[PDB]
């Protein structure tokens, strides 16, 4: 009945740097006769469950290392990590539990920073097998490139093509974060007989000019 | 009852226009009455202790 | 501190009946109020009801109020959560929590099961050809590409596990017809191309259907 | 056939808990639907609930639905009747019947134990004189008159059950302040008048008064 | 949801006289599959459990003498007694057993009758100790009368009474169907400080002159 809010949503800050996330309240959440924040804040890793990691918005559970604080008062509450790790990047939850039922926060994803890459590009054409069944899809690899802001641009005969195209990210490379996009289009045996140069064009804050990769039809 | 007061009196109850004073009559009770208790009964009445601790917490901890 | 054991994993077909089971080991358990919460895939959490074993007080949430039934058992200290007629719309990893109190924050969480609803399909996998004009000082990629398989999840393994570095996979995507696609491709440098074998070998199992492809570079 | 034993008469303030119980005793009692009737004082039955030993389904009437609980304990034969706050009003005598189907008559049926809610107020025993002047050949009246008495009833009997003939007991009519009155009136010939001695022997009970009235001819 | 309906209320027959009752249902409530009546009859003596009489409205209970009968179909349903005895005198009752919930009937009393009879009267006056409590009480007392048509008025200086009297009668005697009348007036004090003379008139059917019994206050 008392909704929770987050921010930032995604924050992205290097090794060693302070993190300060923010939760807000509809309503006060304090117990009169004990005079204590009643709100928690939750850790979860990816495939595992959920970690508490500070209760009365105040006091820190056994074995929870120094580094992570929490602070504040009426409504507004903010958990601040003094100096981020390589073991912190997770997801981070503001729980209020004063009248049943317990709402949730939204949660927020930590994760590291890193300088500026540049995308090795890749194309693949469809096997013999794909044109068989009906259905032909091309596929162009974006590699290694840090950051996300970014995008891909099919060519077809100097004709833009839309509404036909998926995109999957993978999560960032543990070792060094690094991305890698793939952008795939699917058309039928009809819009392959289309024409005769397929590219894939790609656009990346870090890379200076566009690049381009096109195979022809033979 | 307001929270946490004992209220320890034996009056007699007028639930009707009638003042009898004291004479537990038609339409004046006892408030107080006992508590069946027998060994060979349901568990729903049966004798159950209660004990409830109350923390607080103000100065001088 | 007492664990919570969750009982397994169950995939079922629409309009059946689930039962699922959180079991409650350790000292102390006199006064733990069972939670249950539900996780959808990749999204937050989202509290659904909690039960105190023995007395039995239930309280809901207003989404959920009716939909299931929570109950407990005292005697084993088990906590039971109930579907009458699962939908298609249930599939997800669901955690059994125990806190010490009414307004209490939850510490100690079961591992947690899965749910999973629908009609198996199976992979119909397809392997690219590297391009042939390539950096021959550099690397080209390669891979096999997984298709109309349905539902999650696929397994694609290089070279029966030999083979891991630089082979990216990549989450399924849904597209119109519901069966996921996705595809893992490996970055190889043009020298040993000539020499080394590629073989994607897929696996689901809720269609029982394990496949070694080899991948082959092609020329005119 | 196997017969219904009732639990027995309890008198209650307002403001408590009451459990009734039936009683099953007997071969073949594998199907017998129990069904609770409750009687006003004079006035025609009410069927009240239907429950199956067992299985526990339980059909009420609309007007009594959720007012009391009907429920049954297998292992003994025996169906509850609980009252969770009775009021003033529930003075009445309940039965209980046992068919041997739905849509079934009821046959089988139990003593039936009554119920009284209220306050105990005794009562004030004054005697009528006979009037002097009557038929000296005849007949005259005497009896004594029971008055503010609650609840009924109250029990008058004759020179310690001596004298049985021509004893008129009238029920007793509830005037404006409640508590109803009664006059008992023997008709005796004008011989016996000066011989033969009347004593009225009013029983309370609830209020545990037992007054012995003599009845006087008053004269000049 | 299916409300009956009885007739006659009281019905008055002498000794073995045939008896009709009368039930009405307001649907009919015949089994389609094996064409029976659903309905029963019930016979209550006073003072004990009602038993049954009639099921499936045609058929006896084992036990049952042959007196009685029953007959109807439709909604209209009755209930015959060829003659009558001196045990029927009781109330009857009408239920179906169609559908859930059971309704029953009102309920019919079936006693006997006499020849028409005289009541001989009675009057007492309070005594002593009604007087000192506050609230005199006067009372007249017709006896071995039948039948109840009848009404007793008070008389006070040749003025009416109304709405200060009780009337008690009593149920029929067994061994002689003879009834017996209490009317009782309370007046307070200052009601009996009122006047001279206080008397009991009686009109009965029978009686073919109204009958007076006067006492003097004195």
């Known amino acids: 009945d008392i909704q929770l809010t987050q921010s930032p949503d995604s924050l992205a800050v290097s090794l060693g740097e302070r993190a300060t996330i923010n939760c807000k309240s509809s309503?006060?959440?304090?117990?009169?006769?004990?005079?204590?924040?009643?709100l928690a804040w939750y850790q979860q890793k990816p495939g595992q469950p959920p970690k508490l990691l500070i209760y009365?918005?105040?006091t820190r559970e056994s074995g929870v290392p120094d580094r992570f604080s929490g602070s504040g008062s009426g409504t507004d509450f903010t958990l601040t990590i003094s100096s981020l790790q390589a073991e912190d990047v997770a997801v981070y939850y503001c729980?209020?539990?004063?009248?049943?039922?317990?709402?949730f926060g939204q949660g927020t994803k930590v994760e590291i920073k890193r300088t500026v890459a540049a995308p090795s590009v890749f194309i693949f054409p469809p096997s013999d097998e794909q044109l068989k069944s009906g259905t032909a899809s091309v596929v162009c690899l974006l590699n290694n490139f840090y950051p996300r802001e970014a995008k891909v641009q099919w060519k077809v005969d100097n004709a833009l093509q839309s509404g036909n195209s998926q995109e999957s990210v993978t999560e960032q490379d543990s070792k060094d974060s690094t991305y890698s996009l793939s952008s795939t289009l699917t058309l039928s045996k009809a819009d392959y007989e289309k024409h005769k140069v397929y590219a894939c064009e790609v656009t990346h804050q870090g890379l200076s000019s566009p690049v381009t990769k096109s195979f022809n039809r033979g | 009852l307001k929270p946490f007061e004992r209220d320890i009196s034996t009056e007699i109850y007028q639930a009707g226009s009638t003042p009898c004073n004291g004479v537990e009559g038609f339409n004046c009770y006892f408030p107080l009455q006992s508590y069946g208790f027998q060994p060979t009964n349901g568990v729903g009445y049966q004798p159950y202790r209660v004990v409830v601790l109350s923390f607080e917490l103000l100065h001088a901890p | 501190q007492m664990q919570l054991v969750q009982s397994g994993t169950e995939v079922k077909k629409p309009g059946e009946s689930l039962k699922i089971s959180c079991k409650g080991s350790?000292?102390?358990?006199?006064?733990?109020?069972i939670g249950w919460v539900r996780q959808m895939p990749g999204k937050g959490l989202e509290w659904m009801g909690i039960?105190?074993?023995?007395?039995?007080?239930?309280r809901y949430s207003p989404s959920f109020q009716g939909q299931v039934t929570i109950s407990a058992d005292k005697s084993i200290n088990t906590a039971y959560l109930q579907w009458s007629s699962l939908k298609a719309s249930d599939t997800a990893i669901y955690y059994c929590?125990?806190?010490?109190?009414?307004?209490?924050?939850?510490?100690?969480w079961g591992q947690g099961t899965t749910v999973t609803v629908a009609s198996t399909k199976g992979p119909s996998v397809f392997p690219l050809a590297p391009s042939s004009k390539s950096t021959s000082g550099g690397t080209a990629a390669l891979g096999c590409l997984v298709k109309d398989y349905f539902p999650e999840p696929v397994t694609v393994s290089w070279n029966s596990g030999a083979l891991t570095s630089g082979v990216h996979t990549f989450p399924a995507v849904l597209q119109s017809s519901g069966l996921y696609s996705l595809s893992s491709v490996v970055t190889v440098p043009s020298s040993s191309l000539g020499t080394q074998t590629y073989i994607c070998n897929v696996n689901h199992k809720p269609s029982n259907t394990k496949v070694d492809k080899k991948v082959e570079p092609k020329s005119c | 056939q196997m017969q219904l034993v009732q639990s027995g008469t309890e008198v209650k303030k307002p403001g408590e808990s009451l459990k009734i119980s039936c009683?099953?005793?007997?071969?073949?009692?594998?199907?017998?639907?129990?069904?609770?009737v409750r009687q006003m004082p004079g006035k025609g039955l009410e069927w009240?609930?239907?429950?199956?030993?067992?299985?526990?389904?339980?059909?009420?009437?609309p007007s009594f639905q959720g007012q009391v609980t009907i429920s049954a304990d297998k292992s003994i034969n025996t169906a509850y009747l609980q009252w969770s706050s009775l009021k003033a009003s529930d003075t009445a005598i309940?039965?209980?019947?046992?068919?041997?189907?739905?849509?079934?008559?009821?046959?089988?049926?139990?003593?039936g134990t009554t119920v009284t809610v209220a306050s105990t107020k005794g009562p004030s025993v004054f005697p009528l004189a006979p009037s002097s002047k009557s038929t000296s050949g005849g007949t005259a009246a005497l009896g004594c008159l029971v008055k503010d008495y609650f609840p009924e009833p109250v029990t008058v009997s004759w020179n310690s059950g001596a004298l049985t003939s021509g004893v008129h007991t009238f029920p007793a009519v509830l005037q404006s302040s409640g508590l109803y009155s009664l006059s008992s009136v023997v008709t005796v010939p004008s011989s016996s008048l000066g011989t033969q001695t009347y004593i009225c022997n009013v029983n309370h009970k609830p209020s545990n008064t037992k007054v012995d009235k003599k009845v006087e001819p008053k004269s000049c | 949801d299916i409300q009956l309906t009885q007739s006659p209320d009281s019905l008055a027959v002498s000794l073995g006289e045939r008896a009709t009752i009368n039930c009405?249902?307001?649907?009919?409530?015949?089994?389609?599959?094996?064409?029976?009546?659903?309905?029963?009859?019930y016979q209550q003596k006073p003072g004990q459990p009602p038993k049954l009489?009639?099921?499936?409205?045609?058929?006896?209970?084992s036990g049952v003498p042959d007196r009685f009968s029953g007959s109807g179909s439709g909604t209209d349903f009755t209930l015959t007694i060829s003659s009558l005895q001196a045990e029927d005198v009781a109330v009857?009752?009408?239920?179906?057993?169609?559908?859930?919930?059971?309704?029953?009937?009102?309920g019919t009393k079936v006693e006997i009758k006499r020849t028409v009879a005289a009541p001989s009267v009675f009057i007492f006056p309070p005594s002593d100790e009604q007087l000192k409590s506050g609230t005199a009480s006067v009372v007249c007392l017709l006896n071995n009368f039948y039948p109840r048509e009848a009404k007793v008025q008070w008389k006070v200086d040749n003025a009416l009474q109304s709405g200060n009297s009780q009337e008690s009668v009593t149920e029929q005697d067994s061994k002689d169907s003879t009834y017996s009348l209490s009317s009782t007036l309370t007046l307070s004090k200052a009601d009996y400080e009122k006047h001279k003379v206080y008397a009991c008139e009686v009109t009965h059917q029978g009686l073919s002159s109204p009958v007076t019994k006067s006492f003097n206050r004195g």
């Open positions: 009365w918005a105040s």
């Open positions: 039960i105190y074993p023995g007395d039995s007080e239930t």
């Open positions: 729980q209020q539990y004063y009248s049943t039922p317990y709402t």
């Open positions: 309503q006060s959440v304090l117990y009169s006769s004990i005079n204590k924040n009643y």
């Open positions: 350790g000292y102390g358990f006199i006064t733990y109020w």
């Open positions: 929590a125990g806190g010490s109190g009414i307004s209490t924050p939850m510490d100690v």
